[PDB]
């Protein structure tokens, strides 16, 4: 049974500098086009016709302000294929209509599929359990919820995040003003998972590094480890006593410790994704009804919650006309919300 | 009165807050960086109005 | 009736009880404001 | 305040049901032969 399929299989799995695999057929072109689209757009391509913004090095933007911006709102959720009815095979017009945005979003999505398939394929060849791919499910849930489902729930791709540093910052602030996203318990669980994950990373690294066995003569202690050694390189018993006495509880089981290091940031990201699916539909955690009833009836009742809402109102009114140009907003000065003096 | 403009902000559960909206509120702008321990107040009622708990904590 | 050979005992150790209770209680402390609305 | 009237029982059962689940499993683990 040595046919062309098995010969190709042989070639794909050669132990070379950069592993290819069957998954590589999907992963490499898609990742390359996604990165290339971004670099190409941020270097050369405008957002004048879609947003009324300069967005490239060519126009005078810097690394923080370049972006590949979303298509105009009038495009709706068009796949905006180069050979599609909008661009009609015209490359220049396609760039001007925002086709690079969907090019990057879609190729990027298939690329992420490719990467997770790669994690599976390599795990299988080497003979380890596939927890790395499993953990990668969280980046996938995030990308899919934020870059696809969220704008699919809204009016058009226009309201997806645009691919750029400052553009992303704008996405954050928009979510605050319009969605009150910081109030959302799903976002909050996300925050707990990210910061808790960072905390675990730091504390675990530092603990290992500070309960090392002296396994060599050098004052720089990195050389006193050998990959093939059977022995733990640090003392779990000392680590355990230290933390039990410092913080009251400590890990005692290394397998549980490492699983927990998977569980915390992965679960956090998954929760954030769920909340974003809600925001796709404007199904927000925007208000507490009891708060609003009390506040509406009682002009002396004030909390940090009501204060934050006044900030959000400011954001919406002052950012909307330029951020949502298709609405043709004209807000006369006299209607703009402002406190005293400012 | 966090901002020293006689506009008291409610932070506690018993005064209309939930876990999400609740806070111990920063000390008054009228105070600035002045040290405001309990014994600098004429009374606990004053201490409380001006945000003394914040500094203590 | 003959016994089923697929039966297995179940366990939850004390640490897992504590972690579980912390999860549920913290989840409640978090979501309760929204339940009261 | 005009809170949602189901919030109290929602919260109580939210806590009670899974906690009781865990307590049941814990105690019967302990009672198994040492």
């Amino acid at each position: 049974e040595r046919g062309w399929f098995d010969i190709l299989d042989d070639w794909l799995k050669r132990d070379r500098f950069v592993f290819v695999g069957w998954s590589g057929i999907l992963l490499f072109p898609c990742a390359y086009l996604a990165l290339g689209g971004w670099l190409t757009g941020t270097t050369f391509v405008t957002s004048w016709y879609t947003h009324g913004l300069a967005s490239s090095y060519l126009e005078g933007c810097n690394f923080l302000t370049v972006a590949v911006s979303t298509p105009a709102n009038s495009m709706g959720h068009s796949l905006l294929l180069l050979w599609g009815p909008e661009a009609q095979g015209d490359f220049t017009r396609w760039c001007q209509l925002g086709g690079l945005w969907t090019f990057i979003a879609l190729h990027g999505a298939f690329g992420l599929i490719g990467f997770m398939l790669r994690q599976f394929e390599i795990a299988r060849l080497v003979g380890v359990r596939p927890y790395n791919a499993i953990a990668f499910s969280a980046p996938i849930a995030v990308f899919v919820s934020v870059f696809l489902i969220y704008p699919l729930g809204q009016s058009s791709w226009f309201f997806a995040p645009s691919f750029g540093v400052a553009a992303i910052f704008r996405f954050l602030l928009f979510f605050q003003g319009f969605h009150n996203w910081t109030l959302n318990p799903f976002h909050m669980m996300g925050v707990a998972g990210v910061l808790g994950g960072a905390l675990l990373c730091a504390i675990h690294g530092a603990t290992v590094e500070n309960t090392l066995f002296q396994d060599g003569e050098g004052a720089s202690t990195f050389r006193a480890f050998n990959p093939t050694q059977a022995e733990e390189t640090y003392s779990m018993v000392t680590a355990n006593r230290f933390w039990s006495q410092i913080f009251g509880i400590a890990f005692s089981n290394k397998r549980w410790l490492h699983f927990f290091m998977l569980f915390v940031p992965v679960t956090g990201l998954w929760m954030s994704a769920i909340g974003v699916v809600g925001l796709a539909l404007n199904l927000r955690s925007y208000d507490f009804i009891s708060q609003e009833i009390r506040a509406a009836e009682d002009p002396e009742f004030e909390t940090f919650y009501t204060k934050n809402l006044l900030l959000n109102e400011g954001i919406r009114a002052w950012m909307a006309p330029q951020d949502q140009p298709h609405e043709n907003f004209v807000f006369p000065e006299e209607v703009l919300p402002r406190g005293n003096a400012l | 009165d966090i901002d020293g403009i006689r506009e008291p902000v409610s932070g506690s559960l018993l005064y209309g807050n939930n876990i999400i909206t609740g806070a111990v509120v920063p000390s008054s702008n009228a105070i600035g960086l002045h040290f405001y321990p309990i014994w600098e107040a004429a009374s606990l009622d004053e201490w409380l109005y001006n945000g003394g708990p914040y500094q203590l904590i | 009736m003959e016994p089923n050979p697929n039966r297995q005992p179940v366990e939850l150790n004390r640490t897992s009880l504590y972690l579980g209770l912390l999860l549920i209680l913290v989840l409640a402390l978090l979501f309760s404001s929204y339940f009261f609305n | 305040m005009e809170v949602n009237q189901l919030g109290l029982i929602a919260t109580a059962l939210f806590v009670l049901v899974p906690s009781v689940f865990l307590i049941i499993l814990y105690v019967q683990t302990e009672s198994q032969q040492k």
Partner: peptide, 30 residues
Amino acid sequence: METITYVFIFACIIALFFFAIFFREPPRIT
């Protein structure tokens, strides 16, 4: 009723801290 609920959950948590620290299963070197 709300405030009682919040404070109660909090109190249960502090109690849990107490049991988890002082009445933990002791770690044993096998």
